[PDB]
Amino acid sequence: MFENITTAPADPILGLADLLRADERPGKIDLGMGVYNDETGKTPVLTSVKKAEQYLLENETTKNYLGIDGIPEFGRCTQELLFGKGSALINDKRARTAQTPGGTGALRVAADFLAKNTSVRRVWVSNPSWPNHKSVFNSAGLEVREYAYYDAENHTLDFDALINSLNEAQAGDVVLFHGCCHNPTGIDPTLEQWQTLAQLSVEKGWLPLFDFAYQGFARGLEEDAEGLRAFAAMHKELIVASSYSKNFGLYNERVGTCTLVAADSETVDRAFSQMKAAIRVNYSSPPAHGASVVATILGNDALRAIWEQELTDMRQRIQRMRQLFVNTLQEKGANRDFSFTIKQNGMFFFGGLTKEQVLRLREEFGVYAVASGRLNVAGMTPDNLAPLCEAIVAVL
C-alpha cells in the first residue's frame, strides 16, 4: 500500500524545528515559530499556571470523560472574554462553545461542520496569512480564495484593495478575519475600519469566521476584542475560533474553543448538535488538563490577577524588544529603516526581508526565521540582539 506514497513537503513553520535540531552550531538564534521567550531565551510555564496545576493535583478526584463540548465553566469564561460580561449573545443564549484541541482544532472542527452541514464552498483568507489556514480548509474540502490586505510598499493595510477584492465574495461565503495581531503582518484594522467591515459583511451576506490566537497581545483583552464585538452586534450568525496557547503559554496542552452564534438559542442548539457530531467522529472529547488550568485561573480572582499581570509583562517585553531592535539596527549601520516594525502588533516582524535574505541568515549566520521574512520578536533577548542585528545588516 505504502510503496508509491510521496514524502510530504515540510511545514514552513514547524519544519524549522527540525533544521534547527540538526544544526550543531552554538550561536543559533531561533526566531521561527511564534512562542514567547523571556529575557533569558526560555519559554517558561506561567506562575499562575503552576498554581492552577497544584490546585488540580490536590483537588482533582477523577479523570472521567469530559463530554463532547468539554468543561462548561471553561466555555462560559471564554464567552465573556470574547463577547464581554453583559453581551447580548450570552444573555439571549445565542452562543454555544466547544472546548477543542488548540486553535487549530477549532478551525478544523468549524471547517468539518461547515463542509458537511451548510452550503459553504469558499473561504476567503487574507494575503498573506498563517500558512496552515489554507491547509485546514482544503482538507475539509473547501475552496480557499484570497483577499488583498498588506501593502508591501507602504507596510500598511491597503483598505481599498481589501474592500475591492472582497466584492468578489458572494453571499454565503465564509470570510476569515484575524481578531488582532494579524499573523504575519501585525497590521490590524482600526476600530473604524472594523465597523465598516461589519456593515459591508452584513450587507453582502458573508459568514464571518474569526481566528483569535493572540488576544491580549496587541493592547489588552477587551481592546483586542473590539473588532469581533463590532461584528457580534450586527450579525445573526458567526463562528469564532480561539486559542489559549499563546496568552496562557499553554502551547502543548492544546487549549482552544469553537463558538457558534445563531439568530436564536433554538437554532444555535440545532447547529451545535451537528458540531458535536463532527467532534465525536474526530477526537471524541477534548483534553481536560489545559482547559482546567484556564477555567481555574479565570474563575479565581486572585489567580486571574497574577495571570493578567503576566500577560502584560509578556506584551511589554515584546514592545521593548522591537524598539531596541530598530535602535540597534540603526547603530549597526542598517541601510534600510525599520521604523514600521514598531507599528506592528503581536510577536512578529514582517516586511523587510526577502526569501533569499532569510535563507542566507540561517545558511551562514544560524539565524532561523520563516521564509516569508517573518521574525519572532518575542524570541529576541538583550543578549542575542547584537549578533542578530549584525547578521541582518550583513544581509541587507
Ligand X SMILES: *Cc1c(COP(=O)(O)O)cnc(C)c1O
Annotated catalytic sites, by residue? Answer: 130, 211, 246
Instruction: Return the range that interacts with ligand X (CB under 6 A); candidates 36-44, 100-108, 114-122, 328-336.
Output: 100-108
Sign of the alpha-carbon dihedral angle for 317, 253, 126, 240? negative
Q: Record the cell numbers describing residue 246, joined without a space.
A: 499563546
Residue type for position 112 = D
Task: Return the one option of its own copies, ligand X, none that residue 67 interacts with (CB less than 5 to 8 A, by type).
Answer: its own copies
| The binder of ligand X chosen from 103, 216, 286, 352 (CB under 6 A) | 103
Residue type for position 104 = T
Q: Which is nearer to ligand X, 55 or 283 (CB)?
A: 283
Residue 211 near ligand X by CB under 6 A:
yes
- Residue 305 to residues 65, 80, 300, 309: CA-CA distances in angstroms? 30, 16, 9, 6
Q: Record the cell numbers describing residue 168, joined without a space.
A: 468578489
| The binder of its own copies chosen from 135, 195, 319, 381 (CB under 8 A) | 135
Give the annotated binding-site residues for L-aspartate: 34, 130, 183, 374
Contacts to its own copies from residues 194-213, by CB under 8 A: 207
Contacts to ligand X from residues 243-302, by CB under 6 A: 243, 245, 256, 284
Q: In b/e form, how buried is each residue of 162-181, taking b as 16+ CB within 10 angstroms? A: beebbeebeeebbbbbbbbb
Task: Return the one option of its own copies, ligand X, none that residue 26 interacts with (CB less than 5 to 8 A, by type).
Answer: none
Q: Which is nearer to its own copies, 123 or 391 (CB)?
A: 123
Instruction: Return the range that interacts with its own copies (CB under 8 A); candidates 50-58, 79-87, 153-161, 344-352.
Output: 50-58
Residue 192 near its own copies by CB under 8 A:
no
Task: Return the one option of ligand X, its own copies, none that residue 366 interacts with (CB less than 5 to 8 A, by type).
Answer: none
Instruction: Return the range that interacts with its own copies (CB under 8 A); candidates 216-224, 274-282, 331-339, 377-385.
Output: 274-282
Residue 183 near ligand X by CB under 6 A:
yes
| The binder of ligand X chosen from 79, 104, 165, 296 (CB under 6 A) | 104
Contacts to its own copies from residues 296-335, by CB under 8 A: none
- Residue 361 Cα to chain centre, angstroms: 26
| The binder of ligand X chosen from 102, 128, 249, 290 (CB under 6 A) | 102
Which region holds residue 7: left if phi is over 0, alpha if psi is between -120 and 50, else beta? beta
Nearest Cα neighbor of 55 from 300, 274, 273 is 300
Minimum gap (Å) between residue 213 Cβ and ligand X: 3
Q: Which is nearer to ligand X, 98 or 268 (CB)?
A: 98
Contacts to ligand X from residues 328-357, by CB under 6 A: none
Q: Record the cell numbers describing residue 58, joined without a space.
A: 490536590
Minimum gap (Å) between residue 6 Cβ and ligand X: 26
Output the DSSP codes for 146-187.
EEE-EETTTTEE-HHHHHHHGGGPPTT-EEEEESSS-TTT--
Residue 150 near ligand X by CB under 6 A:
no
Minimum gap (Å) between residue 136 Cβ and ligand X: 9
Residue with cell 464581554: 84
Residue 352 near its own copies by CB under 8 A:
no
Minimum gap (Å) between residue 262 Cβ and ligand X: 23
Instruction: Return the range that interacts with its own copies (CB under 8 A); candidates 5-13, 178-186, 304-312, 320-328.
Output: 5-13
Name residues whose C-beta falls within 8 Å of residue 52's C-beta, 6 or more positions apart in sequence.
Answer: 292, 293, 294, 296, 297, 303
What whole-number distance in Å separates Cα of residue 96 and Cα of residue 90?
9
- Residue 177 to residues 12, 209, 214, 287: CA-CA distances in angstroms? 21, 6, 13, 27
- Residue 319 Cα to chain centre, angstroms: 18
Name residues whose C-beta falls within 8 Å of residue 347's C-beta, 6 or more positions apart in sequence.
Answer: 34, 36, 181, 214, 217, 246, 318, 376, 377, 378, 379
Residue 126 near ligand X by CB under 6 A:
no
Minimum gap (Å) between residue 45 Cβ and its own copies: 5
What track of x and - describes contact with ligand X for positions 39 through 78 (by CB under 6 A)?
----------------------------------------
Residue 170 near its own copies by CB under 8 A:
no
Residue 167 near ligand X by CB under 6 A:
no
Q: How many helices (H) and strands (E) does the chain have?
A: 15, 13
Q: How long, in residues, is the chain? A: 396
